[PDB]
Amino acid sequence: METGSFTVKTERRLQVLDVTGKVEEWLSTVGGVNGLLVVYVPHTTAAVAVNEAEPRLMEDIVEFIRELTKPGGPWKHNLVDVNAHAHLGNTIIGDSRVIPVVGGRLSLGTWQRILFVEMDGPRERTVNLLYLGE
Amino acid sequence: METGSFTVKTERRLQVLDVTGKVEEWLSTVGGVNGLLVVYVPHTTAAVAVNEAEPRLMEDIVEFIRELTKPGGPWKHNLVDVNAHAHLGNTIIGDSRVIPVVGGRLSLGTWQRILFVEMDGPRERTVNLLYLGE
Amino acid sequence: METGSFTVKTERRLQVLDVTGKVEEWLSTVGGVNGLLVVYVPHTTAAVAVNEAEPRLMEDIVEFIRELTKPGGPWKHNLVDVNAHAHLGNTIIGDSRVIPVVGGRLSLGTWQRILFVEMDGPRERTVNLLYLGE
Fold this sequence. Notes:
Structural class of chain A: alpha+beta
Distance between the termini of chain A: 9 Å
Order of helices and strands of chain A: EEHEEHHEEEE
CATH class of chain A: Mainly Beta
Number of helices of chain A: 3
Number of domains of chain A: 1
CATH architecture of chain A: Sandwich
Number of strands of chain A: 8
CATH superfamily of chain A: YjbQ-like
CATH topology of chain A: Jelly Rolls
Oligomer: homotrimer
Shape of chain A: elongated
Largest interface: A-B, 31 and 28 residues
C-alpha cells in the first residue's frame, strides 16, 4: 500500500473546501489501477464528506451544520473549550471515506467531490491518504 | 477484486428502499469467502445506510430526514436547483459502506439491512459494488 | 485477514463509551504492520464514532443525539417498539469505521478515540473487528 498526506489551510470558523484536486494528484503520483483509496482526517473538529462543490450549496452546508451543532450553544464541553459544535458535526458527518479506484478511475460520481469540512477554523489542517491495491 | 452494479428505481421524492437482496446476489455471483464489500452510490442527492427494514421505521427515517434537511427550505442552493435538502441528507448519512465478508458470510447483524435512501426521486438510481479479497 | 470481536456492556439508555483500548489490544494480538482495520457493530440501535473522549463532550454527544432523534417522540415505529430514536441516531452516525494501520501505528489523530455510542441500553453489546493487510 501507498501512503500520503497534504495540508489544508482553512480561513473561517466553518468552511467547506473542495480538495478533490489534491487527492487525485497524490493518486496519480501513485498510479493505482484497481484498489481502494481511503481519505481521512486525524481531526476531531473537522470532517470529510462527498458531495457537490457548488458554491451556494457549500454555504448551505455550513449553515445546516451551524443549525444542528449550535456553535457557542449550551454544551457542557464549554467549560473546557469553545468548539463543542465542531466535535458534534464531526460525529455525524464522519472523518474518513473509502473510494474505489477501478481501471485507474477514481470511482466518484459525475457530481461528487471530496469536501473538507472545517468547523473550528482558521487552522492549518491535514488530510491523510492511503492506497491499497494494484 | 470484483466489480459490479445494479439500478434502483425510486418512486417518491423521499424514500427508503431495502436493497440487501441485490447486493447478496452479486456477491454470490462472485463467491467471495474472506474480504470486504464496498457498497456505494455515485449520487450526491441519495445515500446508503444500514439499519432495520421495518416498514414503519422506514417511514420514520424519511420524516426524520425531512425535519433536518427541510425540502424547499431557505437554502441558497434554491437559486440553482430545488434539491438542497437531499445534498444535506447525503452529507450526514453517507454514500458508501464497508461490509466484511467472512467465511462466505456477509457480516451484517441479525437486523441490519442495506438501505438505499432516495431524497430526490423519482429517479433511476445506481448502486455500485466492489469486492476485495479471496 | 484476521478477525475478532469484544463485548461492550452499556449501563444507560444513551451512553458513549471509549473502546479504543480493547481495539488496540486485539490489534496487537494480531501484530499488523500495514493494512486496514475495520471497526463495526452489528447493531441497528447502536453506533460507532471517532472523536475526543472528553467526559463533558461525551455528555454533550448524548444530549445532541437526544435532541435530534427524540426518544419517545412521535415516531410510527412506536407502534412496534420503543427505540425508534436509536435507529435514527445509528443512520447518521454510522455503524462502521475504517482505520489505516501504518508501520504498526493505528492511524488515529492525537485526540481521536473509538467511541461506542449506545442509544438503546442497558445492553450487552458487540464490536466486531477485521484486519486486512500485512
